[PDB]
Amino acid sequence: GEEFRMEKLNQLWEKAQRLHLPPVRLAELHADLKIQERDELAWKKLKLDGLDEDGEKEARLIRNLNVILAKYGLDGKKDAR
């Protein structure tokens, strides 16, 4: 049951489901995972071609992921705040 090409997005998405997220957070999450997926493959082309030799294009992925993990608390804080 994987909706993304990378295990990180599927694991994140499936984990979000595991956290019992509401359909809205799962829908918003899927959108962010899709954007993160496309950006991650497109950027992987950048990193593989030699475009992100400084961590600037991936910075958007690391930040977008942190934004998703901050919206769902998938791989970060999970206590109170």
Coordinates of C-alpha atoms in Angstrom, one line a residue:
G1 CA 0.0 0.0 0.0
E2 CA 2.5 2.6 -1.1
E3 CA 1.4 5.9 -2.8
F4 CA 5.0 7.3 -3.2
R5 CA 8.1 6.1 -5.2
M6 CA 10.4 6.3 -2.1
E7 CA 10.0 4.3 1.1
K8 CA 10.6 7.5 3.1
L9 CA 7.3 9.0 1.7
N10 CA 5.4 5.7 2.0
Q11 CA 6.7 5.1 5.5
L12 CA 5.8 8.7 6.4
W13 CA 2.4 8.5 4.8
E14 CA 1.6 5.0 6.2
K15 CA 3.0 6.1 9.6
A16 CA 0.7 9.2 9.5
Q17 CA -2.2 6.6 9.1
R18 CA -0.7 4.7 12.0
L19 CA -1.0 7.9 14.1
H20 CA -4.8 7.8 13.5
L21 CA -4.6 11.2 11.7
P22 CA -7.9 12.6 10.5
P23 CA -8.8 12.5 6.8
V24 CA -8.0 16.2 6.4
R25 CA -4.4 15.9 7.9
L26 CA -3.9 12.7 5.8
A27 CA -5.2 14.6 2.7
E28 CA -3.0 17.7 3.4
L29 CA -0.2 15.2 4.3
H30 CA -0.5 13.4 1.0
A31 CA -0.3 16.7 -0.8
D32 CA 2.9 17.6 1.1
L33 CA 4.2 14.1 0.6
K34 CA 3.4 14.3 -3.1
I35 CA 5.1 17.7 -3.4
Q36 CA 8.0 16.4 -1.3
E37 CA 8.0 13.3 -3.6
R38 CA 8.2 15.2 -6.9
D39 CA 10.7 17.7 -5.3
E40 CA 12.7 14.8 -4.0
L41 CA 12.9 12.9 -7.3
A42 CA 13.4 16.2 -9.3
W43 CA 16.0 17.3 -6.7
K44 CA 17.6 13.8 -6.6
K45 CA 18.3 14.5 -10.3
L46 CA 19.8 17.8 -9.1
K47 CA 22.0 16.1 -6.5
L48 CA 22.9 13.3 -8.9
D49 CA 23.8 15.8 -11.7
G50 CA 25.8 18.0 -9.3
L51 CA 23.3 20.9 -8.7
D52 CA 22.9 20.7 -4.9
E53 CA 26.6 20.4 -4.0
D54 CA 25.9 22.8 -1.0
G55 CA 22.6 21.5 0.4
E56 CA 20.4 24.4 -1.0
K57 CA 17.9 22.5 -3.2
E58 CA 17.7 19.7 -0.7
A59 CA 17.2 22.4 2.0
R60 CA 13.7 22.8 0.6
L61 CA 13.2 19.1 1.0
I62 CA 14.6 18.9 4.5
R63 CA 12.5 22.0 5.4
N64 CA 9.4 20.7 3.6
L65 CA 9.8 17.4 5.4
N66 CA 10.3 19.2 8.8
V67 CA 7.2 21.2 7.9
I68 CA 5.3 17.9 7.3
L69 CA 6.8 16.3 10.4
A70 CA 5.8 19.6 12.2
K71 CA 2.2 19.4 10.9
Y72 CA 1.8 15.7 11.7
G73 CA 4.6 15.1 14.3
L74 CA 5.6 11.9 12.3
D75 CA 9.4 11.9 12.9
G76 CA 10.0 14.7 15.5
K77 CA 8.3 15.8 18.7
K78 CA 5.3 13.7 20.0
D79 CA 4.7 14.7 23.6
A80 CA 3.0 18.2 24.2
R81 CA 4.7 21.0 22.3

